[PDB]
Amino acid sequence: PLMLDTAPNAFDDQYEGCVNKMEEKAPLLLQEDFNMNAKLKVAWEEAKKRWNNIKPSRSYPKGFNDFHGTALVAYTGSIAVDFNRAVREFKENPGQFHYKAFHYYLTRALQLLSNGDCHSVYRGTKTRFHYTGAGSVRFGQFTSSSLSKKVAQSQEFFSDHGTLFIIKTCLGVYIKEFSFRPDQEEVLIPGYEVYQKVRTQGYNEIFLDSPKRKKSNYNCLYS
């Protein structure tokens, strides 16, 4: 099983105070990520084509650019697994993290698209999660979820071997208009949101409540 805690070793940059500097530097950072991350480069090039098609259908927040849209599209893609891993195991060895620009653009995309809105979402997994009694929980890595418990419990994401999270989030963003699969009613949650109330029920249900934004362990690391 996997441990559920405050994600002490996860890269959790919120970029407080360095948004302007990052938008200027992230483009070169992205080329660097690409030069050492073939899978990301491929996933990005494909996400860009899809973004080009998505963009014309709606207006986006002031400042939301193609990097933001492409990063969000790519995340609902297959690159999500390796990216989440890289972020989760960051502190383990930060020297080989090749999502410097990607992480920034995805984080900023969610910040630009976020409002006050809180949601009741569900997340199903096939891997069992054990709450290690830290006192609160953060996912650390970005994590997808669905407004529909049915979607979350589908054989696509869930199994008896796994866990069903019942989450109240207030930083999560509804990104239906970015997902490769539009029936998922996906809500994307940043890894730095904290759940002050944690309750395990039975062998595979975990209720995460009292969401709150709190400072991250890392800030503007690559700025």
Side-chain angles (χ1 to χ4, degrees):
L2 300 179
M3 303 306 102
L4 214 230
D5 54 21
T6 70
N9 309 304
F11 187 53
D12 56 359
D13 215 325
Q14 292 183 48
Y15 309 95
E16 304 202 55
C18 59
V19 161
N20 294 320
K21 182 47 199 182
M22 283 307 283
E23 294 293 345
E24 184 178 74
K25 164 141 88 155
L28 16 175
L29 279 177
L30 189 65
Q31 160 176 283
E32 274 169 38
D33 285 332
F34 286 9
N35 292 333
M36 291 187 68
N37 191 340
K39 289 186 181 181
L40 166 63
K41 179 174 185 185
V42 166
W44 183 277
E45 292 176 342
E46 300 174 48
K48 186 54 168 55
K49 290 174 191 163
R50 166 60 80 80
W51 167 243
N52 287 343
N53 290 326
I54 288 171
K55 191 174 180 181
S57 63
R58 317 159 133 282
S59 58
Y60 292 87
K62 172 77 163 190
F64 193 96
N65 59 47
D66 295 340
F67 288 106
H68 301 131
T70 302
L72 205 50
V73 169
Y75 186 79
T76 64
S78 68
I79 199 58
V81 163
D82 196 68
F83 170 52
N84 288 340
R85 187 195 184 186
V87 168
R88 176 197 318 128
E89 316 185 332
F90 182 81
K91 211 180 197 301
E92 286 40 53
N93 106 287
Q96 301 297 307
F97 179 70
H98 303 112
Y99 289 100
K100 299 179 182 52
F102 189 79
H103 182 279
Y104 170 69
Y105 285 132
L106 182 60
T107 300
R108 193 54 182 160
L110 293 195
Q111 283 167 358
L112 293 181
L113 294 175
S114 195
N115 304 312
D117 305 33
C118 298
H119 303 92
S120 279
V121 295
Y122 307 85
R123 182 196 183 204
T125 69
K126 297 188 182 197
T127 298
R128 178 69 49 70
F129 276 82
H130 288 344
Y131 174 49
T132 55
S136 62
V137 164
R138 293 200 309 168
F139 278 113
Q141 61 172 60
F142 287 83
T143 74
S144 49
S145 65
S146 173
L147 288 165
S148 164
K149 177 176 173 183
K150 183 119 180 167
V151 168
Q153 278 169 161
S154 67
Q155 300 268 296
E156 291 298 305
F157 314 106
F158 183 86
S159 73
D160 305 307
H161 278 285
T163 290
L164 178 66
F165 293 90
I166 304 179
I167 313 166
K168 188 211 166 190
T169 177
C170 291
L171 292 176
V173 169
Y174 180 59
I175 58 171
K176 177 160 181 169
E177 317 306 304
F178 283 97
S179 177
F180 279 93
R181 299 189 169 179
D183 48 301
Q184 311 315 290
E185 295 312 298
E186 197 176 311
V187 162
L188 190 55
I189 309 167
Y192 52 81
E193 176 164 63
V194 180
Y195 304 100
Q196 309 180 90
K197 193 176 187 173
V198 184
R199 180 174 62 94
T200 291
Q201 173 176 295
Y203 279 113
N204 52 37
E205 296 203 318
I206 300 185
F207 292 74
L208 294 175
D209 283 280
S210 298
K212 171 174 197 174
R213 194 171 117 282
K214 289 179 173 176
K215 303 152 195 176
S216 275
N217 299 137
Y218 291 96
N219 188 64
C220 301
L221 186 61
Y222 298 113
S223 69

